[PDB]
Design a protein around this ligand. Structure first.
Ligand SMILES: O=c1ccn([C@@H]2O[C@H](COP(=O)(O)O[C@H]3[C@@H](O)[C@H](n4ccc(=O)[nH]c4=O)O[C@@H]3CO)[C@@H](O)[C@H]2O)c(=O)[nH]1
Ligand SMILES: [Cl-]
Ligand SMILES: [Mg+2]
Length: 325
């Protein structure tokens, strides 16, 4: 279809969607964190901070932090066994308090993973995750927020790809998905930066000691050109990731302006024999560099099977206006 046909279908799929309740949740959680240790900062991150709007089927992410974690505003995050042990421990404690205060709520401590996390379902249309002692999640939400503030309307491209990636089964929330919603946001931003619709923000300029624990609403307008700006962006995104991004030689990166190579990171076939993450092999078929973590591939679950699926789906979106027409 034309940019206009695509832009118009997408805007109609979002007309139901356009229509600071977080504060009340924040406070309920801090009631709990204060019961463990009252000197503890509670910080919001996730899409609610990236977008500045609180979505539909959308939970909130919080992290617990010490005064001195917050002062070490640019400190990296230890991947040691000591580092995780410590965080699993403070979340044990906070989990016990949540449960004592709120009987209706399910509170699960997840252990299959790189990052300890406590997962809360209240049922009332209230879900959230609490992590502990980590700055990179508030850091990278703040950076993608920086980027979307440059250009408020660009969030419609972002949101359109988020929803599609769940519809196609590519998204890591779905069984058999390989890139998280977070990884797709790195891709959209990377794309936008290569078209010159955003000026580069170096990742080291983001300081946790300077971010608002619960940041302001960034209002979302309806596209006023009937979605022409939008369907042109969608169609371009997909062209760029199909016939412009060289997945065999290049890495999707936000650490640098310009191209990053698989070769300069040692993100090669040889390296797949030696790289492991969660007692499992890491794949360097579709390479996405985390801005803050050491030598972390966000597309590390994109096996050669899943790299094929992604091409296939990027082609189908060209015709169906991201599965809307
Ligand atoms: O691979 C990831 C995935 C998520 N994130 C951060 O967590 C935020 C919300 O992620 P969500 O996928 O809703 O829930 C996550 C987070 O609460 C937590 N998490 C996971 C990975 C991580 O690096 N940091 C982190 O806090 O684990 C859960 C299961 O993936 C994103 O916006 C990112 O800033 C990442 O930094 N890396
Ligand atoms: Cl193309
Ligand atoms: Mg979450």
């Amino acid at each position: 279809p034309s940019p206009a046909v695509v832009g118009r279908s997408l805007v109609n799929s979002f007309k139901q969607f356009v229509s600071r309740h977080v504060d009340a949740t924040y406070r309920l959680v801090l009631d709990c964190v204060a019961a463990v240790d009252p000197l503890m900062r509670l910080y919001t991150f996730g899409s609610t901070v990236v977008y500045g709007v609180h979505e539909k089927g959308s939970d909130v992410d919080f992290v617990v932090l010490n005064k001195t974690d917050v002062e070490d505003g640019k400190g990296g995050d230890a991947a040691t066994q000591v580092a995780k042990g410590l965080q699993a421990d403070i979340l044990a404690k906070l989990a016990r308090v949540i449960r004592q205060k709120h009987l209706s709520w399910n509170v699960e401590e997840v252990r299959r993973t790189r990052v300890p996390v406590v997962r809360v379902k209240g049922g009332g249309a209230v879900d959230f995750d609490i992590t502990a002692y980590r700055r990179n999640g508030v850091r990278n939400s703040a950076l993608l927020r920086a980027y979307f503030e440059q250009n408020p309307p660009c969030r419609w491209l972002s949101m359109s790809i988020k929803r599609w990636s769940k519809q196609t089964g590519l998204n890591a929330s779905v069984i058999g998905g390989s890139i998280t919603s977070y990884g797709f946001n790195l891709m959209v931003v990377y794309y936008l930066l290569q078209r010159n619709h955003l000026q580069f923000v170096p990742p080291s300029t983001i300081d946790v000691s300077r971010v608002e624990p619960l940041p302001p609403h960034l209002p979302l307008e309806e596209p006023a050109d009937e979605g022409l700006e939008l369907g042109t962006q969608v169609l371009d995104f997909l062209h760029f990731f199909l016939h412009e991004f060289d997945s065999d030689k290049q890495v999707i990166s936000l650490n640098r302006p310009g191209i990053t190579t698989k070769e300069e990171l040692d993100w090669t076939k040889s390296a797949e024999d030696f790289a492991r993450m969660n007692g499992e092999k890491v794949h360097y078929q579709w390479c996405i560099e985390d801005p803050y973590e050491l030598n972390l591939n966000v597309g590390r679950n994109v096996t050669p099977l899943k790299r094929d699926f992604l091409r296939r789906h990027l082609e189908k979106a060209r015709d169906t206006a991201l599965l809307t027409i």
